[PDB]
Amino acid sequence: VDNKFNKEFSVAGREIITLPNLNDPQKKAFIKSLWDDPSQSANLLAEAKKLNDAQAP
Amino acid sequence: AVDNKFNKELQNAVYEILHLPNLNEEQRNAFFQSLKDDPSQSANLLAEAKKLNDAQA
Q1: How far is CA A5 from CA A12, A34, A40, in A?
Q2: Which of A30, B30, B53, B56 has the maximum number of C-beta atoms within 10 A of its C-beta?
Q3: What does the alpha-carbon distance between residue A54 and residue A8 come to, in Å, rounded to a whole number?
C-alpha cells in the first residue's frame, strides 16, 4: 500500500512553519521528525500547535 | 563505499521549499517526491523551486 505520506508531509509541514510563536530550531526539529516518519504527522502537528499556543505572547 | 546521507542539504532544501510563499501544493509535492527519490539533487531542486516561486509572485 502507498500511504501517500509524501503529501501528508507537505500539508503538515506547511502548517508547522506558519505557527508564529515557534522558534527556528523548534520548527526545524519538527520538520526533521515529520520527514523521517510522516506516519506521525498528526501527533507532530498537535505537539507543535500545543507548543506554539503555549509560547504565545 | 561512502555513505552520503545528505542530512544537512536535504533538511535545508525541504525547509526553504516549505517557506516559498508562491508555490502551489502540487509543486511542493512534486519537489518532495523527487528529493526523497534522489537526495543528491537537493541543490538543483531547491534552485528550480525558487525560480518557480519568483515566477509566481
Answers
A1: 10, 10, 10
A2: A30
A3: 25
Q: Give the resolution value in Å.
A: 1.3
Choose from A10, A30, A34 for mutation: most chain B CBs within 10 A: A10
Q: In terms of DSSP H, where are the helices of chain B?
A: 7-19, 25-37, 42-55
Task: Say how many C-beta atoms besides its own lie within 10 A of residue B4's C-beta.
Answer: 8
Give the technique used to solve this structure: X-ray
* Domains and their CATH numbers in chain B: 7-55 (1.20.5.420)
N residues, chain B: 57
